[PDB]
Design an enzyme around this catalytic site. Structure first.
Site, PDB file in Angstrom:
ATOM      1  N   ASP A 131       0.912   9.458  -2.534  1.00 54.01           N
ATOM      2  CA  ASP A 131       1.197   8.018  -2.722  1.00 54.01           C
ATOM      3  C   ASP A 131       2.714   7.809  -2.926  1.00 54.01           C
ATOM      4  O   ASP A 131       3.479   8.284  -2.082  1.00 54.01           O
ATOM      5  CB  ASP A 131       0.294   7.427  -3.850  1.00 54.01           C
ATOM      6  CG  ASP A 131       0.503   5.945  -4.108  1.00 54.01           C
ATOM      7  OD1 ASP A 131      -0.004   5.128  -3.312  1.00 54.01           O
ATOM      8  OD2 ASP A 131       1.241   5.603  -5.071  1.00 54.01           O
ATOM      9  N   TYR A 134       7.521  -0.198  -7.032  1.00 55.86           N
ATOM     10  CA  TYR A 134       7.254  -1.137  -5.920  1.00 55.86           C
ATOM     11  C   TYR A 134       8.281  -2.249  -5.819  1.00 55.86           C
ATOM     12  O   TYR A 134       8.247  -3.034  -4.867  1.00 55.86           O
ATOM     13  CB  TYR A 134       5.895  -1.817  -6.151  1.00 55.86           C
ATOM     14  CG  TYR A 134       4.690  -0.918  -6.006  1.00 55.86           C
ATOM     15  CD1 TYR A 134       4.069  -0.747  -4.773  1.00 55.86           C
ATOM     16  CD2 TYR A 134       4.144  -0.273  -7.111  1.00 55.86           C
ATOM     17  CE1 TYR A 134       2.905   0.012  -4.652  1.00 55.86           C
ATOM     18  CE2 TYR A 134       3.017   0.533  -6.993  1.00 55.86           C
ATOM     19  CZ  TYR A 134       2.401   0.676  -5.762  1.00 55.86           C
ATOM     20  OH  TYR A 134       1.303   1.486  -5.659  1.00 55.86           O
ATOM     21  N   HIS A 145      -8.474   7.266  -1.309  1.00 52.13           N
ATOM     22  CA  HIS A 145      -7.071   7.300  -1.720  1.00 52.13           C
ATOM     23  C   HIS A 145      -6.749   8.406  -2.728  1.00 52.13           C
ATOM     24  O   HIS A 145      -5.635   8.922  -2.706  1.00 52.13           O
ATOM     25  CB  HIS A 145      -6.668   5.932  -2.321  1.00 52.13           C
ATOM     26  CG  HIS A 145      -5.237   5.896  -2.775  1.00 52.13           C
ATOM     27  ND1 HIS A 145      -4.188   5.936  -1.865  1.00 52.13           N
ATOM     28  CD2 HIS A 145      -4.729   5.884  -4.031  1.00 52.13           C
ATOM     29  CE1 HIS A 145      -3.082   5.920  -2.595  1.00 52.13           C
ATOM     30  NE2 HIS A 145      -3.355   5.903  -3.903  1.00 52.13           N
TER      31      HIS A 145
HETATM   32  C1  LIG Z   1      -2.224   1.856  -5.396  1.00 55.68           C
HETATM   33  C2  LIG Z   1      -3.483   1.980  -4.615  1.00 55.68           C
HETATM   34  C3  LIG Z   1      -3.432   2.351  -3.290  1.00 55.68           C
HETATM   35  C4  LIG Z   1      -4.559   2.483  -2.511  1.00 55.68           C
HETATM   36  C5  LIG Z   1      -5.776   2.227  -3.126  1.00 55.68           C
HETATM   37  N1  LIG Z   1      -7.003   2.310  -2.516  1.00 55.68           N
HETATM   38  C6  LIG Z   1      -7.975   2.011  -3.348  1.00 55.68           C
HETATM   39  N2  LIG Z   1      -9.288   1.997  -3.036  1.00 55.68           N
HETATM   40  S1  LIG Z   1      -7.439   1.599  -4.931  1.00 55.68           S
HETATM   41  C7  LIG Z   1      -5.807   1.848  -4.461  1.00 55.68           C
HETATM   42  C8  LIG Z   1      -4.680   1.711  -5.241  1.00 55.68           C
END
Ligand SMILES: Cc1ccc2nc(N)sc2c1
Ligand SMILES: Cc1ccc2nc(N)sc2c1
Lengths: 539, 539
Positions: A327, A458, A516
């Protein structure tokens, strides 16, 4: 009822046994049967082997004494040293036996290893040291004959065992491959298992404990207990300290988590990578856990975060590290590769692709173009997302950390809906990926600084875009790995499709049925991909 | 008046220069003169080299562009890659230039490195990364052209330099080996030095600063600034945590101090051993500094201290470490070698000999027999030595830490006199070995726990004797080093005379005109002995 399980090392937790080496040596060299196994046990309780096993002498002192006992004349180039070196070297952990001990401990059992062993001072002693290191961590106790000055089958070692277990004999299962060493435990009233083949031994173990140990579903990799880790702290500048957890020896591997995570998001990777031969440094990234969390937005731009990670290496005396990110951590790691290639041994990202900055479009325009990036616009206004994320921490982490099929948060029209959790339950169910205790660890970590520092990652879109534009003429030519997750609906695999234009030698990994939260969703597969890539490309 | 000094890298802080490689290549390959140095500078400010130097492109992207500029036809097996690899590899730190920069900084100068350099992504980039790591630590600033997007001789980089220094041009000395790059600094009003041979450059530098830089006495090794170190913490059991400072990569080297010391007693060894290619772990031993200090005497017996050091390795994921000890730390390290050889890569002791326990005499009898060991009897009664040592910490450390010729404490008739400092001044002079700031560091460390835990190391004579007697049939057969100090009047070199009977392969070191505080008395010689021994015997 049984509450403790005791395992021998040779022929039980580790295979093949040494008794199953001296016999094979006799056969290979056409020597009379049992000659080597007789010289090994000569003098019985008063012999050189008992002295070695009680810790009176070391293995290197025992070698000439074993040679005298061996002295049908033996061959020309004979070496007790070479035979024993090869035997110890061949001995590996008996994985299904270890897996059964792990399951019994998980179910409340006190587990122990009781072994007749020696003080190893051979030039090759590290092999056995590594083996014992790996095994011992999984047990409540390790009782070694050479450390206690008592050996099996002497009755004193069994009383010592019961004293250390704080248990009555009838509460103990004792597994051994030597009948004579099993005998005193039985006479004392302990349940005993004569181990020949593992499968039969485990069937007997399953029958006596009433716990399924054979044919069980694939277990998760070893995790981390925070209180058992080495915790490191480096001041990178007057008001900024970085915390990390450190495990293992070998090339430095720096793990960089994403939003809103912790060093603990790498819990399944840390023991596996250290066991694979690496020195793991799992960071609490700036703004998180025990690392400093300054309030200023600019403190979280990629240029400053990258400079601080270079200072971190400088202060630890590391000329390089392999950088692995997920991430936001993945974004950081690609920029470390672009701006500080000399400090990056190799680079790997989970989910986050490398997409060069577009000089002809503002980063706000680019984010607005994709509906799945709406949550990033919601994160822009200082205070809004902090208030929603900080209101109920348990709810925050339980709603976020979900596998692909577990009603994952929707990330389109987050601004329109007015928040991330507006259409989410007040008391979400616990994901199959996490335990209540793991959720409470994240809750406790976020009680210190909250979400301001993490959300600020961010909040530097324009600043990061201007810095990234300076790298537009560059290519990533150091070893690189991109790992895509099939079901990450934000960081989709397709977003990585053009990466080879900028990283021509890029290697890939792909994980099916993975959301994720890659590291905790699919830990076994992450470990397999990273270890294979590290061993081939990172040395 | 001058208050800042700026050094170039190529041809100033590092030798030989790359300009002095392309010329040699032309000569070795009988190519026309200046051909390679012309292809290197082709296109001037718009050329491939300026792009590389500004960070627009990386070194691996620059290689084919340099080949095109090179395209009297060139030889068959020509490689710009091979030429540049060998050139970078040959370049080493210019030690007298570094020594002069160190002296100017010690005298209050702000020092900086200003260099036209590149983003190195070559498979061999670590060599240069290591070089820059070693150099940069000694300067206030490092300004690299590829990171700032500006190059010498462009006027902007000089204004950037003055801005980072927070100094007027007349306050700055600028040293460079390229006349053209020196020109803009002069035009701005800075003092400039054209560097050809180092000696002439340093004579010019000495003349302009008024500080002796040439013919100076031998400098001390680099020390440690506590706030700049990575600090590690491992819980070894519920109420016991061990603190350590960590620096470097390579085989683990565990430094164990004596009484009444600190990890900081290894300050001169930590940077030297890390630079030599080792991962240094300098402990605060149990009872000291940031490590736990339980009050119970039994918590400090060798058996428990050794078990905790094994747990420390277990928790850090280290199968082995080389163990180096001094005084009580030296005693610990010999016992680690005897009881846990599999965990000890190699063992070295400063001053403390290995003397096997005498089973026919009580340890109290043995200590009473030698007049120099009287202080150990004074340390027996709980509370007596704590009160004298804790009464005035500055006085305690200033009286203890003295070189052999500095009215060292007398240690005979300490009981008869009624204390260690009874015939010592209230305000002792500062030893040549320590600064007031170094004394205050020990004072601050001892404010936490005082002397109870440290004195308890001497309070387990009978317990240690009984444990040591279990090892009487053993020999130390792993790599071992004994370092004796000529003028340690307690741990005399002669006490080590019989060690070869128990450690047959023992290697030795000997330091003349060295008192008890070996590491700080003779740091350069300690470093030389340990590095030579580590490189030959510890891998
Ligand atoms: C920050 C973030 C990125 C992708 C994501 N995907 C999810 N299902 S919760 C989430 C939170
Ligand atoms: C603990 C100790 C040992 C030796 C020694 N020698 C000195 N001169 S002070 C001192 C203190």
């Amino acid at each position: 009822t049984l509450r403790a399980a005791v395992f021998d090392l040779d022929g039980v937790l580790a295979l093949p046994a040494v008794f199953g080496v001296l016999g094979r040596t006799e056969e290979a060299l056409a020597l009379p049967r049992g000659l080597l196994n007789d010289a090994f046990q000569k003098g019985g309780p008063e012999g050189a082997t008992t002295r070695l096993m009680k810790g009176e002498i070391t293995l290197s002192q025992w070698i000439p004494l074993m040679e005298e006992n061996c002295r049908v004349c033996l061959p020309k180039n004979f070496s007790i040293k070479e035979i024993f070196d090869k035997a110890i070297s061949a001995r590996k952990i008996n994985r299904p036996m270890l897996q059964a001990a792990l399951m019994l401990r998980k179910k409340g059992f006190t587990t122990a290893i009781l072994t007749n062993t020696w003080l190893d001072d051979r030039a090759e002693r590290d092999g056995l040291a590594q083996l014992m290191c790996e095994l011992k961590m999984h047990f409540d106790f390790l009782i070694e004959s050479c450390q206690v000055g008592m050996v099996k089958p002497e009755p004193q070692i069994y009383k010592f065992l019961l004293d250390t277990l704080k248990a009555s004999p009838s509460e103990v299962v004792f597994l051994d491959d030597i009948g004579a060493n099993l005998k005193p435990a039985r006479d004392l009233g302990m349940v005993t298992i004569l181990v020949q083949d593992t499968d039969t031994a485990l069937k007997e173990l399953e029958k006596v404990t009433g716990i399924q140990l054979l044919n069980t579903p694939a277990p998760l990799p070893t995790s981390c207990n925070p209180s058992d880790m080495s915790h490191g702290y480096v001041t990178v500048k007057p008001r900024v300290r970085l915390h990390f957890v450190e495990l293992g020896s070998g090339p430095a591997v720096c793990l960089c988590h994403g939003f809103p995570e912790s060093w603990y998001s790498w819990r399944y990777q840390i023991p596996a990578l250290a066991q694979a031969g690496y020195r793991v440094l799992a960071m609490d990234m700036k703004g998180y856990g025990e690392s400093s969390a300054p309030p200023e937005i600019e403190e979280y731009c990629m240029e400053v975060l990258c400079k601080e990670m270079v200072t971190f290496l400088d202060k630890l005396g590391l000329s390089q590290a392999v950088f692995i990110g997920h991430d936001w951590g993945g974004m950081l790691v690609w920029y470390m590769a672009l701006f500080y290639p000399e400090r990056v041994r190799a680079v790997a990202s989970l989910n986050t692709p490398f997409i060069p900055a577009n000089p002809n479009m503002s980063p706000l325009e680019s984010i607005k173009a994709n509906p799945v990036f709406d949550y990033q616009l919601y994160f822009q206004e200082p205070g809004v997302a902090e208030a929603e994320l900080e209101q109920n921490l348990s709810r925050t982490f339980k709603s976020l950390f979900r596998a692909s099929d577990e009603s994952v948060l929707s990330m389109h029209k987050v601004c329109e809906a007015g928040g991330l959790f507006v259409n989410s339950p007040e008391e979400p169910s616990l994901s199959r990926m996490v335990t209540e205790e793991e959720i409470q660890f994240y809750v406790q970590q976020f009680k210190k600084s909250g979400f301001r520092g993490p959300l600020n990652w961010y909040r530097n879109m324009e600043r990061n875009w201007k810095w990234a534009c300076k790298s537009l003429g560059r290519k990533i030519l150091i070893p690189a790995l991109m790992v895509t997750a099939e079901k990450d609906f934000v960081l989709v695999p397709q977003m990585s499709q053009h990466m080879e234009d900028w990283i021509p030698h890029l290697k890939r990994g792909h994980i099916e049925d993975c959301g994720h939260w890659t590291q905790m969703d699919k830990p076994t597969e992450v470990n397999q991909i990273l270890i294979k890539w590290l061993d081939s490309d990172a040395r």
